[PDB]
Amino acid sequence: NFMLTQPHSVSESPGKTVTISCTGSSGSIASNYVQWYQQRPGSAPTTVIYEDNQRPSGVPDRFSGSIDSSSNSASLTISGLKTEDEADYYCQSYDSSNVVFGGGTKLTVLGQPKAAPSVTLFPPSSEELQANKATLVCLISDFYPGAVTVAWKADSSPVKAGVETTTPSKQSNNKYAASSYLSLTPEQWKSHRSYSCQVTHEGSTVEKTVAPT
Amino acid sequence: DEVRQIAPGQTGKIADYNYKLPDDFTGCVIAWNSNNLDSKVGGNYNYLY
């Protein structure tokens, strides 16, 4: 029942000194070796310090750790924060034949330029209609800020059923992209005269329309 | 009025912020009056500090 308590989020400006803690509940922190791992997102974890004072060959000297056995806490001290230091930190223990890791420390990171919300529409294809299904796809791209509201329209009546939209995602050109999908039956697509997608972005509204042709 | 500040072992507002003079200063300082060329009517503010 031995667990390591670690602060979930730690924020500090680069160039300063910060302390990351790792507190053990039942067993004393000085009983077993404590190991810190610095793991980049989407990458394998890498040992950043071990033996509670020993730095591996390759890491900078700023990654220094200390042990406070009175408070049952393991402290890792970082001096002079940099850009590459923004990663997850986990503390390892062993207890008794059962390796126990830490909760994890997240480092807070730090605005894209504004852009016009280009909107495109396509009607459902004939191949999809032959499969007894219909889907209207609304796309929002090359825009900023990433706070857009989509509202499907059936001629004049708004549509909510079957509406699926995607959260904005950053593009390569420092802009954002979004999507919206409206699943419909083949009868409902041809029931109304026209279907339109309205995109609201910073007050301005860009509307495209399609019709069954 | 700031030509007296340029010496090894002085404290003020220009030497300590722009060009400090160390104790082992074997440099050699020459200056002259050039008001007829370095200044003009209407306010010559081309130089900064």
């Binding site: 670690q6 077993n32 070796y33 190991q35 791992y37 793991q39 394998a44 974890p45 890498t46 040992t47 071990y50 033996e51 986990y90 390892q92 062993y94 034949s97 059962n98 390796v99 126990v100 890791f101 830490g102 909760g103 994890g104 280009s118 909107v119 495109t120 529409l121 396509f122 009607p123 459902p124 294809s125 004939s126 191949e127 999809e128 499969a131 889907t135 796809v137 796309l139 791209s141 079957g162 699926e164 939209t165 995607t166 959260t167 995602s169 593009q171 992209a177 979004a178 999507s179 999908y181 699943s183 495209k208 329309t209 399609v210 042709t213 | -």
Partner: protein, 224 residues
Amino acid sequence: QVQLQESGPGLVKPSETLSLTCTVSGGSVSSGGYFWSWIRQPPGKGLEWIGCIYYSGSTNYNPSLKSRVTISVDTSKDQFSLKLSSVTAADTAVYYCARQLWLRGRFDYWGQGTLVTVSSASTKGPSVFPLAPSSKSTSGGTAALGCLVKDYFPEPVTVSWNSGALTSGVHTFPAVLQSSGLYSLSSVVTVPSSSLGTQTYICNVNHKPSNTKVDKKVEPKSCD
């Protein structure tokens, strides 16, 4: 030096045996007197220790994962494999195999993480419907076309345009859960309208979990 790589399926249906094999390149399992371990990490969560093995039959497992971990070592093939029984939807984690120089201390080398996120056994292929551009689909001197990837399970799908020859203007969107279990996404590219009727655009949607590759040509809409 030595390097560890993982293999096996990156997915497993619920309530079934999981099979992940991590092999060793540039080293020997038995020689050196070291240890092997499996460590998993859920997305957005901390690292979790599964178990450790020796090149002999010595095994120890986590109390939370006790009686569910079966790890074996075969020296002839120079690899070690772990078997997980009764997998659920909460076992979605990034599995790492790591060399252990010191059992109660630090690791030295971490293999690349073969993520396994799967919660159901739908295993449905990706429907690829063309997104025909038209006069109302263009705004100015440029037009847009694409393909719709709808009603597939599970993540992910890779979509490429003209076998990867077209990359400029290509936007891949993250999938969103539908009203009934499955996901949906699309991938589109912005093209000038002058080459709409003179250039052929084909989307290549690949779904490795369902072993389905679909190529769909994109053409301008024909009024009927």
